[PDB]
């Protein structure tokens, strides 16, 4: 009989992110007899994976697994797929609760720590910060920056987030516009903090035009091809992050798992229904040539 279907779901086409993800899936496809695919949608308005689920549960693929702009949005149709005996992955979203299990790359806790004490080695433990994140409510960068500052205002009390985090990190320009805006503002601001891959990108655009590299430091989330040039240059200090392949190829490993009716073989929380592996992928300037 022809192979059971594994779809996964981005939070937008066209981005280098979700690219190297989609290799991560059709590799898994390949490597355990799944027919897997990746599905871009046009936009990170939420309604638009909803629309991309409700036409699988449609065509009934046995499968589902995404990357979510919004937890809360998708809850229904999640529900609906559940309903239809479809398996609902997600990655990028703890605790959702209608997904069968979220799979995550790395350790909430120790990836917030490690940005904060990387931040603070370069700025003294003094100085203004400020986050970007890709929405509003896109779960994991929210749930990253609500621990990034906690830890940050149990270690260093001189840092301190110069506004609240800001809505930018999916677009370059805005990206770029916004820290161009605060580092005229903030005399104070010594680091950009982006978890959305393409926020380091305008954010290092922006530090490399005003020539401020050694003054304002720019970390996050990032694809090492995307973001080589800047950090040659130094105007990325640092990616803290992982291989998004790697998260492709798990979605659709443990969707192979589940639709052969085995049980799941990281840290493997039942009650939680989280999956996770402690991943972490720096790129700088002495590795970014090995890293593309
Ligand atoms: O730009 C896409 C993205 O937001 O960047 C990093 C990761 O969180 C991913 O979902």
Redesign the pocket.
Same mark, same amino acid.
């Given at each position: 009989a022809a192979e059971k279907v594994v779809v996964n779901i %981005?939070?937008?086409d066209g981005?280098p992110?979700?690219n190297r993800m989609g290799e991560g899936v059709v590799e898994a496809g390949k490597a355990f007899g799944v027919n897997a695919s990746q599905v871009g949608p046009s936009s990170t308005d939420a309604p638009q994976q909803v629309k991309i689920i409700e036409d699988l549960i449609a065509r009934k693929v046995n499968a589902i697994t995404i990357?979510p702009n919004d937890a809360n949005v998708l809850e229904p149709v999640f529900k609906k797929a559940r309903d239809a005996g479809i398996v609902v992955l997600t990655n @990028?979203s703890p605790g959702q609760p209608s997904a069968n299990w979220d799979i995550e790359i790395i350790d909430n806790e120790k990836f917030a720590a490690e940005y904060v004490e990387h931040m603070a080695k370069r700025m003294g433990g003094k100085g203004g910060y400020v986050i970007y994140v890709?929405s509003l409510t896109?779960p994991?960068?929210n749930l990253w920056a609500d621990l990034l500052v906690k830890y940050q205002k149990e270690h260093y009390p001189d840092m301190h987030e110069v506004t609240r985090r800001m809505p930018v990190? @999916?677009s370059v320009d805005v990206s770029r516009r916004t820290t161009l805006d605060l580092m005229k503002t903030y005399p104070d601001l010594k680091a950009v903090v982006s978890?959305? %891959?393409?926020g380091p990108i305008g954010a290092g655009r922006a530090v490399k035009e005003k020539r401020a590299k050694n003054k304002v430091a720019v970390y996050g989330?990032?694809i090492p091809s995307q973001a080589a040039s800047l950090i040659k240059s130094g105007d990325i200090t640092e990616g803290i992050?992982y291989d998004?392949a790697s998260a492709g190829y798990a979605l659709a490993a443990v969707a192979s798992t589940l639709l052969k009716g085995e049980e799941i073989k990281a840290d493997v929380d039942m009650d939680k229904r989280i999956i996770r592996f402690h991943k972490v992928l720096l790129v700088n300037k002495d590795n970014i040539d090995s890293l593309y």
């Open positions: %981005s939070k937008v981005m992110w979700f990357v @990028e890709g896109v994991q960068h990190a @999916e978890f959305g %891959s393409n989330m990032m992050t998004p």
